[PDB]
Design a protein around this nucleic acid. Structure first.
Lengths: 122, 122, 125, 122
DNA sequence: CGACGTCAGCTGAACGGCGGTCGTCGATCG
DNA sequence: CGATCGACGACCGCCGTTCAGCTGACGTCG
């Protein structure tokens, strides 16, 4: 059939607009959410390793970090209460987008599929 | 767990170096192979629609197209015999890379998983 | 220098927008004025021969003629002819076209103008 | 007397058949000579600006240009060795027609008259 | 002398192509 | 690790090109 990369690509092409439209009314972009979640799971890290874990340039991560400081999400930076709440609601919303693309599969199919994706990386 | 985009991303991050290392000793990059396969499936296409289908800018596609002209792969462009043979061998090697990443799954698991991706992609 | 046709052309290209912009606030185009003046000089002419004298097709001339009937300038019932309003319109049209003429010819002195017009009228004849 | 436009018209109506009969045994029409002379004075010009300077539509100018290509007159087109000579002889015959209409004026009258036309033309 | 069939020739719209413009990413030193 | 310099690459205006749609001009006619 079609190359594996093509299929991953098409699933990504379905997923990313949904995640974008979902994050949009929260005042968040996709990279900003990435940063949110990284700092929410690993508090305290500096900007450089943030950029290293998200495969972006330090300047992009600093732009994001300033947008999040100005928004009162972050204060060797770390998260604040507003940042935690924002992270929660963002997480929930992207999970909703996830459910909405994964809905073409039955629930068992979903579980097994996530196991398989989990395995193919690792 | 982890967001769907993260998992898709990690699988892509496993696959892309593999397809790169696979295409490398054929003198092909990944976009050049994309162009190859596109023209191999739909001969005659012009530069604009070539670029439209691969989600790239027309100038990138023109760079790729002239690089393929210089190699005697392409002649409203279309493929040559050398281009067809090259396309076949390329197909084969990226499919080998695919097999090599998909190998962590059993064969039935592989088939089922690819069915699942094919469905999840609209 | 440049061919005579080029020069005649450039003078025409200066003149025609002037006569057009001049005829415009009277509700007249250039062919309509041509027809007006023809009928003002030779009343009674038919649609066909009107078109023959202006080097245009009969259907175009009938278009202008229908416009001039609707405006109360001409009465056709082949042999068309002018009305009072049509003659007055023809008069002021004449005057305005003469004003455009004066405005392009003004780059020349008056004797130069007279002599030049003699010269053009001879080259045709 | 008669409106100025009538006079320009009558002189044009005398001149144009003469120029046509003059250009005819050279295998040239009037627009072809126009294009020829334009390229003879300004080599290199493209078809669009050629048509734009001659007050014609681009398709007419392209018709003329392909006719002059077939005759080995033109090659952003430009003139050829045959085209330059053809342009010279064309210039000459059109100049002869000019002389034939202008002959109704004395030579000083001719010179002064051409001074007057050039002045009246913006 | 009008009228109609036939069709070449002109105008408005979308496509492909290309410059000026600037944001953004590697490569250095501090 | 943060900063700057140098330059490749992506948006985006205008220009040339094309085709659809149609009003105009010849070549028959009663």
């Amino acid at each position: 059939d079609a190359p594996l990369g093509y299929l991953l690509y098409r699933v990504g092409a379905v997923l990313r607009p949904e995640v974008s439209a979902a994050l949009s009314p929260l005042g968040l972009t996709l990279p900003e959410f990435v940063c949110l979640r990284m700092l929410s799971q690993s508090p305290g890290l500096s900007s450089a390793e943030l950029a290293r874990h998200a495969s972006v340039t330090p300047q992009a991560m600093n732009t994001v970090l300033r947008k999040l400081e100005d928004a009162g999400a972050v204060a060797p930076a770390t998260l604040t209460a507003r940042g935690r709440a924002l992270a929660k609601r963002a997480e929930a919303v992207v999970r909703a987008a996830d459910a909405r693309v994964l809905a073409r599969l039955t629930a068992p199919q979903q579980r097994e599929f996530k196991r398989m994706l989990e395995k193919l990386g690792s």
